[PDB]
Amino acid sequence: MENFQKVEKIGEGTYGVVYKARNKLTGEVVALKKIRLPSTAIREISLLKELNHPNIVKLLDVIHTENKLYLVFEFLHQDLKKFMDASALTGIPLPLIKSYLFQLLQGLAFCHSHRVLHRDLKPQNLLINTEGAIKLADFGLARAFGVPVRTYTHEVVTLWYRAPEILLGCKYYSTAVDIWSLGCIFAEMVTRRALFPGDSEIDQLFRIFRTLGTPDEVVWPGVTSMPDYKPSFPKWARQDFSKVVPPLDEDGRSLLSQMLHYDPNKRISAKAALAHPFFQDVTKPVPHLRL
Ligand SMILES: Cc1nc(C)c(-c2ccnc(Nc3ccc(N(C)C)c(Cl)c3)n2)s1
């Protein structure tokens, strides 16, 4: 770590704090994730160094030294969260929303083809550059490790993009959890409001049920047998997407509805989503970035 000079803090994840830093050997600026503290973890994270794609933030190095684990990522100039906040008065242009969703589906189709799941997509780990690219950052493992950031900071775990199977206690979930999260982020880019801003696990689940209807065996076979399912859940009727994401057109609303299917087996895959008619006229616009 003597080779890196911290510039400023740029983020706080669930298990690590992220800094902008300078590599003293090469002169390059990087994003450095510091995890406060497992051999299986070192091996699995090292496998992520091989997972290279245009829509994935490059994991440059894994440094294991003195009861800390440092992840060195390529540096991108802004996150989607800052861009959405900066665009709150005007809205992100629909062609740019479509480009970003298309690129993130390309990134997910690639990592899902290598049986790599993100598991915690959110605007703070979607990174953009001045050329119009957007990239997925910091893929999570199935087994969590290290001191959680919430125990030594004022930061809280966001549940807003969590798939309903995770909230209902499925421990052997699929790549469909990332498609759900991405659908939630797509709706938030379009409407400029989070789709399901829950502040507890039950509030998160009941916000999903109030919009999409309480799931039952008809729409989700096996839902009533899931670990955290309760027959005492209130029964809410489903709402129309025309109410949930105006002014999205019918192709975008149909795609979103397929990304938000309750049954993970019915939920569209990233590969199938790339072929959706919504992307017939996709382009790659330039964002207006204030850095
Ligand atoms: C939570 C995160 N995890 C990672 C690994 C992150 C990462 C990876 C690569 N580049 C960047 N850049 C970046 C992020 C945020 C900001 N401001 C707007 C908060 C900036 Cl100015 C740059 N962040 S951000």
Curated annotation (Swiss-Prot):
Belongs to the protein kinase superfamily. CMGC Ser/Thr protein kinase family. CDC2/CDKX subfamily. The gene is CDK2. The active site is at D120. The record marks K9, K81, K82, L159 as: CDK7 binding. Gene3D superfamilies: Phosphorylase Kinase, domain 1, Transferase(Phosphotransferase) domain 1. This is Cyclin-dependent kinase 2. It comes from Homo sapiens. InterPro entries: CDK, Kinase-like_dom_sf, Prot_kinase_dom, Protein_kinase_ATP_BS, Ser/Thr_kinase_AS. Changing P38L: In a glioblastoma multiforme sample; somatic mutation.
